[PDB]
């Protein structure tokens, strides 16, 4: 009856940023101490809380989002940001109350020769609403001309692969990120710490 973080932060399989991944946690406990005594993360900022004095802070249920993004895009995962990622892959709300945890995983997410399994939505007609998930693969239509499956002028496939390759400068390496989302509506809050 502990909150199953161990299967989110240590999961061998992360999803692409565009198809970011979510796990709702409820009915358990949580040791937010161990997460920031591990001290193995590169970036760990928390907005609208404070990791230490959060073990007494109970919440109805907490969400844990995970994906993978270029090292210099982790600045886009913050409340009030814009860019390729925050605008078309995962947008954080202005009034955000949670934590953003990232840790360079180039020793696993950029195999020899280039890892092309991780993608990032590149073309979109308007921006994401907070915690929105766009999975559409339909051919992006830049012009008046309906594409209907044909790549070509004014016709672009929206999802572009990262060129993950380990020799690249750190900025262009894979950084596994897992955003923690704490919410509390008027209902039995069951995600307490000790």
């Amino acid at each position, epitope marked *: 009856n502990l909150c199953p973080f161990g299967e989110v932060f240590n999961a061998t399989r992360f999803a692409s940023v565009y198809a970011w991944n979510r796990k709702r946690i409820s009915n358990c406990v949580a040791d937010y101490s161990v997460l920031y005594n591990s001290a193995s993360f590169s970036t760990f900022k928390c907005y609208g809380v404070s990791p230490t004095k959060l073990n007494d802070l109970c919440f109805t249920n907490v969400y844990a989002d995970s994906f993978v993004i270029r090292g210099d895009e982790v600045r886009q995962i913050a409340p009030g940001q814009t860019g390729k990622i925050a605008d078309y892959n995962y947008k954080l709300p202005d009034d955000f109350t949670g934590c953003v945890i990232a840790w360079n995983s180039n020793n696993l997410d950029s195999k020899v020769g*280039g890892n092309y399994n991780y993608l990032y939505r590149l073309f979109r007609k308007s921006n994401l609403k907070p915690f929105e998930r766009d999975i559409s693969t339909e051919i992006y239509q*830049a012009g008046n001309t309906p594409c209907n499956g044909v790549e070509g002028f004014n016709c*672009y496939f929206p999802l*572009q692969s990262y060129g993950f390759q380990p020799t690249n400068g750190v900025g262009y390496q894979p950084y596994r990120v897992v955003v923690l989302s704490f919410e509390l509506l008027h209902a039995p809050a069951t995600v307490c710490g000790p």
Partner: antibody
Amino acid sequence: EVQLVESGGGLIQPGGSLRLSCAASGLIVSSNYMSWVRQAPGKGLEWVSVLYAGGSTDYAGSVKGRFTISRDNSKNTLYLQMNSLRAEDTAVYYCARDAAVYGIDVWGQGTTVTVSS
Amino acid sequence: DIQMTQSPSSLSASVGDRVTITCRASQSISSYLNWYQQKPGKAPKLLIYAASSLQSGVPSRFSGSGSGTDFTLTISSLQPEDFATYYCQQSYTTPLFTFGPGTKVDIKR
């Protein structure tokens, strides 16, 4: 009739304002990465600023807070307002649709910005 | 950021020659850069996108290769309408592109 005819820009003192116009036709500027790239006589191609489909913008440190990319999606036109102009800005300005990986395929005709007092 | 760099600052070539221009980027841009042609007074012209996909409306004699960090444009038979400067661009940070110094192909003599 895929073409981008840019206009608005000739000569103006160091500090004055001049708005540029890119009249898209064939594509839509409302759903495209619309960039401006500047180029001097004895220099290469330098990116100046960007406007996404989601309306988000971004400009190079030597511009930030002096120019301001715009667009009117009722006239299918891309704009660029240039305030507190200086001598470093003297160069030809091209508007072009960045097709991401597919590359900058469509390019504006041409517009010169000689700037000096 | 990513640094781009052309090889011969300006090479010399004849009509019917087979020219080869180079371009290498700071990181391992994996197959994500196109090639451009510019004649004085005109706008750039796209030639190759995504390393080696030929642009429609572009002669058959324009090649394209490179995939990792060191790329290369190669024209089969230089025709007179091909004397111009050719630049390369990186579409890795796609919204925020950069170019190379360009390589000016003139007439050998």
